[PDB]
Amino acid sequence: GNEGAIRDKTAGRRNNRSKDVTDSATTKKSNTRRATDRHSRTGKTDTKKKVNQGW
């Protein structure tokens, strides 16, 4: 509880300030996938009969 929280060193600002900052902080967007956007993953395909029945 609150006694805990004030008494706990390894807490508060000074302690953080003195730690190194990770590199994933200064990362970048990620992106993951995009030049696959037009490439269908479904592996299924339709078929000229089903399409011709539909449309």
Partner 1 sequence: SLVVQEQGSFQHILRLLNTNVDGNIKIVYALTTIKGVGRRYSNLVCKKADVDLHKRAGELTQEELERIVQIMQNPTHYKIPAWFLNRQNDITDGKDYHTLANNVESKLRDDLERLKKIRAHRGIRHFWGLRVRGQHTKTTGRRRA
Partner 2 sequence: PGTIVLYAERVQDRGLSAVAQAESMKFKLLNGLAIRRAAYGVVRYVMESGAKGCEVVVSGKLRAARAKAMKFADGFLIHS
Partner RNA sequence: UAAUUGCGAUAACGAACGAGACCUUAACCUACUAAAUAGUGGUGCUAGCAUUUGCUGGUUAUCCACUUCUUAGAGGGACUAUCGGUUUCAAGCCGAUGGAAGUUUGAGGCAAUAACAGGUCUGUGAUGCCCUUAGACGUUCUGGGCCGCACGCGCGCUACACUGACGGAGCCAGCGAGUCUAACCUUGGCCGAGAGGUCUUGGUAAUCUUGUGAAACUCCGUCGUGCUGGGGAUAGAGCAUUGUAAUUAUUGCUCUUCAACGAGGAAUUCCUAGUAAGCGCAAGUCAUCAGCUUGCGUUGAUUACGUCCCUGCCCUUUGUACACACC
Alpha-carbon Rg for the chain in angstroms: 28
Question: 37 — phi, psi (to 5°)?
Answer: -60, -40
Between 2 and 47, CB nearer to partner 2: 47
Residue that is written with structure tokens 């956007």 in the block: 37
* Residue 37 interacting partner from partner 1, partner 2, RNA, none (CB closer than 5 to 8 Å by kind): RNA
Which residue of 13, 28, 41, 50 would you call a contact of partner 2, by CB under 8 A? 50
Site residues (CB under 8 A) for partner 2?
42, 44, 46-47, 50-51, 53-55
